[PDB]
Amino acid sequence: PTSGIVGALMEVDEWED
Amino acid sequence: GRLPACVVDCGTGYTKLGYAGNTEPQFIIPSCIAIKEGVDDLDFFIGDEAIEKPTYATKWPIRHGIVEDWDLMERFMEQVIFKYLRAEPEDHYFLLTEPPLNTPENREYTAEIMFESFNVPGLYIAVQAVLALAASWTSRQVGERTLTGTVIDSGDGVTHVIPVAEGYVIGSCIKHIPIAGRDITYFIQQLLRDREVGIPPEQSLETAKAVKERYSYVCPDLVKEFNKYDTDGSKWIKQYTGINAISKKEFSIDVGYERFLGPEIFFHPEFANPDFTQPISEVVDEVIQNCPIDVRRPLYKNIVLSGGSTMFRDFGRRLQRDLKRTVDARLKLSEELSGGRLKPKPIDVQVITHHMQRYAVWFGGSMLASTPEFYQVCHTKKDY
Amino acid sequence: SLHQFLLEPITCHAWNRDRTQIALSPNNHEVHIYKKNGGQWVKAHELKEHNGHITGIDWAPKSDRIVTCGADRNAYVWSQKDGVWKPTLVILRINRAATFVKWSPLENKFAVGSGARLISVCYFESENDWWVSKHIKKPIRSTVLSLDWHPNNVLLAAGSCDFKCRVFSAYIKEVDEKPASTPWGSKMPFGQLMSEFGGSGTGGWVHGVSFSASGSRLAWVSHDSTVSVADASKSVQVSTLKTEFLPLLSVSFVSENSVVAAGHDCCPMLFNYDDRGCLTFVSKLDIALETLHQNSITQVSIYEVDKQDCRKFCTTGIDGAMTIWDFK
Amino acid sequence: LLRGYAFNHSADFETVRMIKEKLCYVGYNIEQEQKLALETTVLVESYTLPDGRIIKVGGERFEAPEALFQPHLINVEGVGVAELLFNTIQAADIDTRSEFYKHIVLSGGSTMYPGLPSRLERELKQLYLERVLKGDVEKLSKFKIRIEDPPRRKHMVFLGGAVLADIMKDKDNFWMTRQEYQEKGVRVL
Amino acid sequence: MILLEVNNRIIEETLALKFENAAAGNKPEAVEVTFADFDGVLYHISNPNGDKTKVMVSISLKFYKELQAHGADELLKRVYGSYLVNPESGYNVSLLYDLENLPASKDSIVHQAGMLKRNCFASVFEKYFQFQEEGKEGENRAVIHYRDDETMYVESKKDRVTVVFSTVFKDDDDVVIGKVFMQEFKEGRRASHTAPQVLFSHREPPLELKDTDAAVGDNIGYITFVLFPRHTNASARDNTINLIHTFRDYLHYHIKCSKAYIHTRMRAKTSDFLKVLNRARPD
Amino acid sequence: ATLRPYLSAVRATLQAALCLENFSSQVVERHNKPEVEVRSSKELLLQPVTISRNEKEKVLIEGSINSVRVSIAVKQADEIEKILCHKFMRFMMMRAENFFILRRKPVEGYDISFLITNFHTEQMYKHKLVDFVIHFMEEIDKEISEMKLSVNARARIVAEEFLKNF
Numbered sequence A: 001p002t003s004g005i006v007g008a009l010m011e012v013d014e015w016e017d
Numbered sequence B: 001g002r003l004p005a006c007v008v009d010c011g012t013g014y015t016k017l018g019y020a021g022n023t024e025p026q027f028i029i030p031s032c033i034a035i036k037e038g039v040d041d042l043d044f045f046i047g048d049e050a051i052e053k054p055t056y057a058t059k060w061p062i063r064h065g066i067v068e069d070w071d072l073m074e075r076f077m078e079q080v081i082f083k084y085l086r087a088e089p090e091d092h093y094f095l096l097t098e099p100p101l102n103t104p105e106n107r108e109y110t111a112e113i114m115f116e117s118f119n120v121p122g123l124y125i126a127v128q129a130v131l132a133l134a135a136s137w138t139s140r141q142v143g144e145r146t147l148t149g150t151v152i153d154s155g156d157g158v159t160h161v162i163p164v165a166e167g168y169v170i171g172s173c174i175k176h177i178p179i180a181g182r183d184i185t186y187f188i189q190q191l192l193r194d195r196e197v198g199i200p201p202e203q204s205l206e207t208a209k210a211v212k213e214r215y216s217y218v219c220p221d222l223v224k225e226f227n228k229y230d231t232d233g234s235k236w237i238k239q240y241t242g243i244n245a246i247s248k249k250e251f252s253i254d255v256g257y258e259r260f261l262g263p264e265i266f267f268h269p270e271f272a273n274p275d276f277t278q279p280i281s282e283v284v285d286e287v288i289q290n291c292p293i294d295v296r297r298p299l300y301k302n303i304v305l306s307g308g309s310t311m312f313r314d315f316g317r318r319l320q321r322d323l324k325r326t327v328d329a330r331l332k333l334s335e336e337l338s339g340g341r342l343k344p345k346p347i348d349v350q351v352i353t354h355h356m357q358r359y360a361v362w363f364g365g366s367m368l369a370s371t372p373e374f375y376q377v378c379h380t381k382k383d384y
Numbered sequence C: 001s002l003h004q005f006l007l008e009p010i011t012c013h014a015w016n017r018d019r020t021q022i023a024l025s026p027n028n029h030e031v032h033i034y035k036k037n038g039g040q041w042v043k044a045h046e047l048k049e050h051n052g053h054i055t056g057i058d059w060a061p062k063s064d065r066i067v068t069c070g071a072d073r074n075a076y077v078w079s080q081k082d083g084v085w086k087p088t089l090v091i092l093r094i095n096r097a098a099t100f101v102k103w104s105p106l107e108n109k110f111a112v113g114s115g116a117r118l119i120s121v122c123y124f125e126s127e128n129d130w131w132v133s134k135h136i137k138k139p140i141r142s143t144v145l146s147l148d149w150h151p152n153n154v155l156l157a158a159g160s161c162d163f164k165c166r167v168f169s170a171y172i173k174e175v176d177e178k179p180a181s182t183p184w185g186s187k188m189p190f191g192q193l194m195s196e197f198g199g200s201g202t203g204g205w206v207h208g209v210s211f212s213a214s215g216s217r218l219a220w221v222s223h224d225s226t227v228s229v230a231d232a233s234k235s236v237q238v239s240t241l242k243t244e245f246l247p248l249l250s251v252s253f254v255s256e257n258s259v260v261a262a263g264h265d266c267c268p269m270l271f272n273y274d275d276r277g278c279l280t281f282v283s284k285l286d287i288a289l290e291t292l293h294q295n296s297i298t299q300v301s302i303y304e305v306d307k308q309d310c311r312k313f314c315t316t317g318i319d320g321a322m323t324i325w326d327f328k
Numbered sequence D: 001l002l003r004g005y006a007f008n009h010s011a012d013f014e015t016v017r018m019i020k021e022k023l024c025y026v027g028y029n030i031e032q033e034q035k036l037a038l039e040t041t042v043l044v045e046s047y048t049l050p051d052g053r054i055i056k057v058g059g060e061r062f063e064a065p066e067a068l069f070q071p072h073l074i075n076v077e078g079v080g081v082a083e084l085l086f087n088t089i090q091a092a093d094i095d096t097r098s099e100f101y102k103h104i105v106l107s108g109g110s111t112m113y114p115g116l117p118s119r120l121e122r123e124l125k126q127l128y129l130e131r132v133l134k135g136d137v138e139k140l141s142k143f144k145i146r147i148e149d150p151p152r153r154k155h156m157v158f159l160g161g162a163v164l165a166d167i168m169k170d171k172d173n174f175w176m177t178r179q180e181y182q183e184k185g186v187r188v189l
Numbered sequence E: 001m002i003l004l005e006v007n008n009r010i011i012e013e014t015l016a017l018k019f020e021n022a023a024a025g026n027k028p029e030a031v032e033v034t035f036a037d038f039d040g041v042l043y044h045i046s047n048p049n050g051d052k053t054k055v056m057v058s059i060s061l062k063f064y065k066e067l068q069a070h071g072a073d074e075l076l077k078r079v080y081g082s083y084l085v086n087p088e089s090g091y092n093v094s095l096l097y098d099l100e101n102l103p104a105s106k107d108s109i110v111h112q113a114g115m116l117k118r119n120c121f122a123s124v125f126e127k128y129f130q131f132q133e134e135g136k137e138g139e140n141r142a143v144i145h146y147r148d149d150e151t152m153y154v155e156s157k158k159d160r161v162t163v164v165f166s167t168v169f170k171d172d173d174d175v176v177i178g179k180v181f182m183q184e185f186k187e188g189r190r191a192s193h194t195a196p197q198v199l200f201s202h203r204e205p206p207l208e209l210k211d212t213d214a215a216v217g218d219n220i221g222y223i224t225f226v227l228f229p230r231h232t233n234a235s236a237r238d239n240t241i242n243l244i245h246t247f248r249d250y251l252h253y254h255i256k257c258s259k260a261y262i263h264t265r266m267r268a269k270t271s272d273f274l275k276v277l278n279r280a281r282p283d
Numbered sequence F: 001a002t003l004r005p006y007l008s009a010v011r012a013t014l015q016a017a018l019c020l021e022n023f024s025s026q027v028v029e030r031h032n033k034p035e036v037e038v039r040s041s042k043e044l045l046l047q048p049v050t051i052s053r054n055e056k057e058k059v060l061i062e063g064s065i066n067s068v069r070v071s072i073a074v075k076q077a078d079e080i081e082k083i084l085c086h087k088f089m090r091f092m093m094m095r096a097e098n099f100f101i102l103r104r105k106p107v108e109g110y111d112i113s114f115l116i117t118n119f120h121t122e123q124m125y126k127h128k129l130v131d132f133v134i135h136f137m138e139e140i141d142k143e144i145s146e147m148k149l150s151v152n153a154r155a156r157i158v159a160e161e162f163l164k165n166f
Ligand SMILES: Nc1ncnc2c1ncn2[C@@H]1O[C@H](COP(=O)(O)OP(=O)(O)OP(=O)(O)O)[C@@H](O)[C@H]1O
Pocket: B010, B011, B012, B013, B014, B015, B065, B154, B155, B156, B157, B158, B181, B182, B209, B212, B213, B307, B308, B309, B311, B312, B358
């Protein structure tokens, strides 16, 4: 489940205007 | 885990193949099948060997995110398994991918084609939203890992907005924007066939796609960019050199105003579609605010992007700015409705971009299928 | 002479006195009234109050009133007091689906046959303006499928799925006046079994019953491809003929001696009954399929002035076509 | 929604209501319903839409109306209509309980499903043969229970109002006079 | 297709891309990929512990010991030259390529890299085909295990050489379909005159294998190829070894293609019946 | 020769059994259900009838007042015919929402089974359904006998192409 997925993750300016 | 699982993702414009536990797909090919119109059934080609071929009729067996012909998908999967991946189907687990809002009939015919014809020991069909959201954790802080978010699934067909809360997909609040990459290249083709002479008619689509992929970005405001183009043309105007299909005569064109009017039809769909006028900044808001009342805040805090058409520069910035603008006014109206005694907490809106954005579904499938407990989830042969 | 109204089936059809208007039910929860403007049929009115499949209609000519019954356990009496037809409510007190309805010769009562092992005879009351019902239920064991009325406005024939054809009396003392003596019997209280038939061993479901003009003879058809005539003047006697064709779904007397039938073979037929008690087949009357109707005929009626002098008869069925047949 | 048919909550509320009105019914015995739904295809019916599409509704006909008898399927805590009726009749004084068993009237438009008359009788008979008179299946014949449900259930509120205004049309105490509120402003009737 | 290719595609594509990009002059990138192929093998392409200017391709056969006993090391030394290296932890054979010192002709090395399985298997066939040419007969047969439930046998006489395959099927459909397909091989020798010979007996081993302890059952079949010295001469050895190398996967591929073909004819008949059914409506 | 009288007899028996009517249930109010699946009143049912040619090919017909059930078993010669017949019937039964007159699972001892209601007799003609059943009983034999030769003829080319090279 989610535990397996999160365990396997590590193993493998011009705008305001 | 004596041998890894196989991951195949089928789409309207591309198909992605590979083995479990790898970061990149080993094959991204077009979803094209070419045939000739005994053992004449096996005389066909798939992928890059089917885009141009003289004595062969080519076609596309996936349109709009559904299967139109199954006799072609069967053959497509035969040459996916037995030529490129080079895997015997009798000793591998398979993790396929379904479109959102898929019928049980379409889901069951795939199982028929797999089990009855290939003797697959195990099959798993997974929704795209959770796999897209799983890949978001590769470029996020350690203190925030949740299955709650809204995915803007873009690509080549139709654009979906799907919210997921605590691992499951909320089917009712799914909405479709009919804009995608195909419309963008059709629009930029019409732009380019009004100003430049030198494009052969045959290579119009290829040049349009190349100009879309190489030079394309979004701007805050249109008038300032139009002024900047004419004021200083040397900086913002580039040249593209192409090779003709006949006699190798090189040709050159200038890229101008079609640079930033290409990806603008997400935010102004009336430029290219007369029957739809709602910007994408509002569809996300209206999809989020039709859900249960206890999960409104986490969905705004996690708006991930999965698909090839969200690969433009500064795409998330426009969504973030527009959503902040349209929620701040609503909170201001609510505050003024109740005098000024109490100020509500401002909603934090956030959009997350990653290195893995073009093939996020395949990456999520690879991460899910490498775990030891994945083999307890699939449907075995005897169940069918 | 064939006319095709609609491609859907016709459940039931009703005629009026002048043979100008027709009421139809095209297999839905509605009744359509058509008139004839010259030489073409054009729809006139729609009547819609049921919320279920409509199963029977009839048209009282002299009073000009349409009784409708259906599978929603309802019945309505439609009348024309202004340009628009209006309904009147009927209290039936049945809990299963109705199956048949028919007016009486004097147009003061009407009989409804239903699937709750009941026969409901309904009559009018004006102190609060509706119809009130009385029940016949004693010897019936199954659903009734056919009904008919005697000329003397008392006796009532019935056929049911329990392989029996019965003759009851439906004398209501509040409305009707005292009757005379018939060969069928003398003592006639309400709901009293007057006669019963159906003993043939391999009996099937009876689909249609009918009385003669004289009132002393009864005829009925069964699902075992048999027709039978029961006489009561000389004695209570029966004569059954075993036809070699498919089942027959309707029957009607043309005269004292001849009877016309129709069914799933799509072709009406004529039988003769001699005075000595013998049935003999005579002929068909219609000498893709080689027949005008493309499906089973469900109802047979008389276009002319009925059993006193009958010349033409009308057939309608599942094909959607309505046909008029003339003997001459 | 779990067949490939997407109807939004707001704009298609009155399109699915016609489907509910036309094709829905309460099952008598759930077992035969599931046997016919699994081994036979005589429950699937095709419905046409205003757009021109044709959808197919199958075993969903007898699942939607059964939120009434089992209220937990749509997250409602309770006992259901059949058991709530039992808990209501078995809460009055003993003498008048027989006066209510014989005369139960159904009203309203949401009790016109086919079979809803014929299911409450079975549920009450079974609920009254294992809670009150436990075992001893002889005296149920003497125990008479009857439910009245004429085919005019929808408008029974109107028809009653069509009678009470007819009887008391003339005598001027039934109505609240206009002049009463000109001085008093309240009412005691 | 008809005939399965003997070259792994992913190795060829990855090494071709990396060699052309290295010759262009751009920086190399990192690659870390794990594959699988037929008969339970497992590849791995990686960088040798941090350095990004070298690539290592390693193979992981589960049954390499018997091939080593029959002399697979000499052919690997002969063919790939100096690219052999000390194997990685948990893998049998490894090849190393350096991107600085690269030959000008990039086609030959990337063509040879894909035939790692063929070169691993070729030693047994080479050694037993030399026996006819040198005439040193009277040697025991050999055994090679593909998987947990299958075997190859090979043996040489003074005038012919023979290889026997043992094949297993799981589904009861495949048993009858395989009996239909592979009965045809027995008459192909009579259909031609310059082809090798094929023999088969069902559910029991042949006379050469009944002496030993083979597997008896309903699902097990024995396919015997008999080759003459004309095919296994020095000039035409490679074409023979390339095609005897894949015969199980060939037959299984055609068996699984036949049922897919049947599904199309089933769909056509379903559509035909639905069409004729709809012609009976009035509408 | 021998198949023609069998088809003639099945035709004659079907024509005498498809004479259906409408019938609401007399047990539960306002339910229209077939009276051959839901078996709730002995009076409404007809006697079953069976017609056969040999010891392994026969048709069973069960009648009622508003439904007919027709179960058919087909010929089988060897194992390949057996498994192809089973695969084909399983293919057809999966697509039963389009085949309006097909039962999902067959009666035990029979391969394929149809259920025809009065609604399917009012929305279609009567003789064309009988003709469809007669077409069904022969076209399947033709199709499977063709598929056998098709699979047999696919081995020659594969064997020849493999043996050609070496
Ligand atoms: N910078 C870019 N890089 C890659 N692809 C891009 C880029 N900009 C636009 N695109 C378009 O993204 C699309 C990539 O296809 P993608 O794999 O996302 O679709 P898909 O999953 O097959 O489709 P769908 O989800 O509609 O079934 C192509 O149309 C490509 O033209």
